[PDB]
Amino acid sequence: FPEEVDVFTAPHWRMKQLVGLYCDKLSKTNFSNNNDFRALLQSLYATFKEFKMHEQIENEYIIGLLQQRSQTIYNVHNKLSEMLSLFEKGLKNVKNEYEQLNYAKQLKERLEAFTRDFLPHMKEEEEVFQPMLMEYFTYEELKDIKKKVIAQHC
């Protein structure tokens, strides 16, 4: 698929880069240490804010359009909002090492589940929405769209 009409690849290269960064931080993080703990949550909150902007950009510049033209919408492209709330909880409601370590176990559980769903969600957009975009829009329309999408991401 021509680079100039690919509306997922570059944003997703950034999102996967962010997944890699938080997985790395997660596994090197000392949850018994309060500073290490908060720094981790702070990184995670910023990261997940960018994920939310990304999904919003998709909704506003790509998905809403594709769904009006194909009318083949049934799945509703929430998750991120619950993850951000989780993080806030850790940054405001955790006082000592006992709470930190109980929290960590839950954080890890929820991030693993998030990650296991987020990668396939992205692959479905590239494998399914991209090709649909080909049949319902012209090549220049798609170029315009990618233009608007990169502007919002970058």
Swiss-Prot record:
Residues 1-154 are annotated as: Hemerythrin-like. Fe(3+) 2 binds at residues 55, 58, 77, 121, 125. It comes from the Eukaryota. Polybiquitinated upon iron and oxygen depletion, leading to its degradation by the proteasome. Ubiquitination is regulated by the hemerythrin-like region that acts as an oxygen and iron sensor. Undergoes constitutive ubiquitin-dependent degradation at the steady state by HERC2. Transmembrane segments: none annotated. Coiled coil: none annotated. It is found in: Cytoplasm, Perinuclear region; Nucleus. Fe(3+) 1 binds at residues 12, 54, 58, 125. The hemerythrin-like region acts as an oxygen and iron sensor by binding oxygen through a diiron metal-center. In absence of oxygen and iron, the protein is ubiquitinated and degraded. Component of some SCF (SKP1-cullin-F-box) protein ligase complex that plays a central role in iron homeostasis by promoting the ubiquitination and subsequent degradation of IREB2/IRP2. The C-terminal domain of FBXL5 contains a redox-sensitive [2Fe-2S] cluster that, upon oxidation, promotes binding to IRP2 to effect its oxygen-dependent degradation. Part of a SCF (SKP1-cullin-F-box) protein ligase complex. Interacts with ACO1/IRP1, IREB2/IRP2; the interaction depends on the [2Fe-2S] cluster. Interacts with DCTN1/p150-glued. Binds a diiron center, that can be bridged by a hydroxo group. The hydroxo bridge is not present when FBXL5 is in the reduced form and seems to play a critical role in regulating iron binding. This is F-box/LRR-repeat protein 5. It comes from Homo sapiens. The lineage of its organism: Eukaryota, Metazoa, Chordata, Craniata, Vertebrata. The gene is FBXL5. The chain holds residues 4 to 159 of 691 of the full protein.
